[PDB]
Write a protein that binds this DNA or RNA. Structure first.
Ligand SMILES: Nc1nc2c(ncn2[C@H]2C[C@H](O)[C@@H](COP(=O)(O)NP(=O)(O)OP(=O)(O)O)O2)c(=O)[nH]1
Ligand SMILES: [Mg+2]
Ligand SMILES: [Mg+2]
Length: 430
DNA sequence: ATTATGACGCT
DNA sequence: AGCGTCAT
C-alpha cells in the first residue's frame, strides 16, 4: 500500500503525424488537400504499393500495403502520389526533410526521442514542474485543452463526438479543480496543455496536423495517441488503466503484436491485457523469461520504466531494395550494378549527415536475402566504412558477400538475390 | 510481387 | 560478429 510504486513519476507524451507522407504531398500539391489520397511506391506492378492513406480514403476501406489498383476498386476517385524514384529505387528524401521540420519544433519544448520518421516521445516531467510554478495555483480552463480527450470519461449521467469530448473534459477538470484528483493527474493535465501548444506550433510552422498521447510512460502514451486520431490528443491517466486494459487485446500493446504476444495469449489462455494481473511476476518470468516477465507484470498494471532517450537523430543510415520473384538478381554484373545504386544514394545521405550533424559512420553492414527465403535477411556481413565513396562502398560490399555465390561461373549468381541492403552504422564524432 | 529501413534483444 | 523480433 504505502510502499508500492504506481509508475506515476513521469509525464511522457507521444506525438505522431496524421497520415504523414500524404500530408507532405498535400502540402506541396494543394489539389490533393481534403480528398481521398494515398502515397504509393513504384507504379508498374498493380499501380504500386500503398504506404500512406488519408483519412478520407480510409473511410472507403483503403489501407497500407494495399495495391493501388485494388484500392481504386474500393475508392474510384482515389488520388495517388508516388514517392520519388532515383537510381531505380525509392527515394524517401522529401519525407526525411519534412520529418526534420517537425522534430526541430518538438525539440524546442523538451528532450525528445525520435521513434520513427513521423513520431517522437517527449519527457515533459521538468516542463510540467516549471509551468506549475508559473501558474501559481491558477485553475486550468477547458479553453487550454481544445483538442484533448480524457480516456474513460465522461462516466455516469453527448450524441455528438465533440459533445462527448467536452463533457469528459469538464468532468475531469471539475474534479481537478475540487482537488479530488491526484498530483499525478494534475501533472498529466499540465502535460496536455503543453502538448496542445506543441501541436499548435507544429501546425502553424509546417502545416502538418498530428495526434498525441499523454500519460506516465511511453507504452501508454503511444496507446493513447492512437485512441482519437486524427488531429486530437488523448490523456490516459493511471486510474483509467483498469477499465482500458479490461477489454484491450494483448496485440494492441507495443512489442506484443508478434510472436511474444501470441505466446502470452496461447500459454496463459487469455485475450486481454487486464487478465495478466492474475499472475505472479515469477509465473510470468517462468513462461516468458525474466525481462519479459517483469515487464509484463508491471505493464498490465500500467507501469513501465523505459526512459525517453535523448536522441533526435537516427542511429543508422540505410537503404534497401527488394527484387521479388522473376526480377531476382542472377548475374554478377547485376548484383554489382545495384550495389552501386544503393551505395550512391547512401553516400549522398551520409555526406549530408556529416555536414548537418557533425558525425561520421565507421561501419558498413551488408545484408542480402536469397530467393526462397522468408527471412528479412539471409546473410549479414560488415566491413570498415573509412570513406564516403560509393565506388569503394559498393566494391567492399561486393567483396564481403561474393562468397555466397554457389555457381562456379563468375558471370552467374546463385542462388538469385531477392534483396540488397546497405546500412551505415557505428557513428562517431566528426 | 508486402517495400523501405528503423531499433534492438539474444547468442 | 551474426541472427531474430517487432515495427509500419
Ligand atoms: N517505405 C515505407 N514507408 C512506410 C511504411 N509504413 C509506413 N511508412 C511511412 C508512411 C507513413 O505516412 C509514415 C508514418 O507512419 P505511420 O505513423 O505508421 N502512419 P501514418 O502517419 O501514415 O498515419 P497515422 O499515424 O495517422 O495512422 O511512415 C512502409 O511499409 N514502407
Ligand atoms: Mg503517423
Ligand atoms: Mg508513426
Amino acid at each position: 500500500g504505502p510502499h508500492m510504486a504506481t509508475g506515476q513519476d513521469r509525464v511522457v507524451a507521444l506525438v505522431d503525424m496524421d497520415c504523414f507522407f500524404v500530408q507532405v504531398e498535400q502540402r506541396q500539391n494543394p489539389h490533393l488537400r481534403n480528398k481521398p489520397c494515398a502515397v504509393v511506391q513504384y507504379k508498374s506492378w498493380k499501380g504500386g504499393g500503398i504506404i500512406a492513406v488519408s483519412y478520407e480514403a480510409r473511410a472507403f476501406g483503403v489501407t497500407r500495403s494495399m495495391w493501388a489498383d485494388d484500392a481504386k476498386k474500393l475508392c474510384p476517385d482515389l488520388l495517388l502520389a508516388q514517392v520519388r524514384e532515383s537510381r531505380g529505387k525509392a527515394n524517401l528524401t522529401k519525407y526525411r526533410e519534412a520529418s526534420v521540420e517537425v522534430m526541430e519544433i518538438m525539440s524546442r519544448f523538451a528532450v525528445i526521442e525520435r521513434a520513427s520518421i513521423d513520431e517522437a516521445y517527449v519527457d515533459l516531467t521538468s516542463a510540467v514542474q516549471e509551468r506549475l510554478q508559473k501558474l501559481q495555483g491558477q485553475p486550468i480552463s477547458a479553453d487550454l485543452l481544445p483538442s484533448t480527450y480524457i480516456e474513460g470519461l465522461p462516466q455516469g449521467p453527448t450524441v455528438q463526438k465533440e459533445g462527448m469530448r467536452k463533457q469528459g473534459l469538464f468532468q475531469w477538470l471539475d474534479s481537478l479543480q475540487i482537488d479530488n484528483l491526484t498530483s499525478p493527474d494534475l501533472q498529466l493535465t499540465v502535460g496536455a496543455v503543453i502538448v496542445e501548444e506543441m501541436r499548435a506550433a507544429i501546425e502553424r510552422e509546417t502545416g502538418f496536423q498530428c495526434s498525441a498521447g499523454i500519460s506516465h510512460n511511453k507504452v501508454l502514451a503511444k496507446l493513447a495517441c492512437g485512441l482519437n486520431k486524427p488531429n486530437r490528443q488523448t490523456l490516459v491517466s493511471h486510474g483509467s488503466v483498469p477499465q482500458l486494459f479490461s477489454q484491450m487485446p494483448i496485440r494492441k500493446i507495443r512489442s506484443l503484436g508478434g510472436k511474444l504476444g501470441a505466446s502470452v495469449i496461447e500459454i496463459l489462455g487469455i485475450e486481454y491485457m487486464g487478465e495478466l494481473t492474475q499472475f505472479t511476476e515469477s509465473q510470468l518470468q517462468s513462461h516468458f523469461g525474466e525481462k519479459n516477465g517483469s515487464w509484463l507484470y508491471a505493464m498490465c498494471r500500467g507501469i513501465e520504466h523505459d526512459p525517453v532517450k535523448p536522441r533526435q537523430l537516427p542511429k543508422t543510415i540505410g537503404c534497401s531494395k527488394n527484387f521479388p520473384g522473376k526480377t531476382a538478381l542472377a548475374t554478377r554484373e547485376q548484383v554489382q550494378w545495384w550495389l552501386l545504386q544503393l551505395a550512391q544514394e547512401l553516400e549522398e545521405r551520409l555526406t549530408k549527415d556529416r555536414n548537418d550533424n557533425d558525425r561520421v559512420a565507421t561501419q558498413l553492414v551488408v545484408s542480402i536475402r536469397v530467393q526462397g527465403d522468408k527471412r528479412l535477411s539471409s546473410l549479414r556481413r560488415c566491413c570498415a566504412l573509412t570513406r564516403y565513396d560509393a565506388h569503394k562502398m559498393s566494391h567492399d560490399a561486393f567483396t564481403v558477400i561474393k562468397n555466397c555465390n554457389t555457381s562456379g561461373i563468375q558471370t552467374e549468381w546463385s542462388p538469385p538475390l531477392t534483396m540488397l541492403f546497405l546500412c551505415a552504422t557505428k557513428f562517431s564524432a566528426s
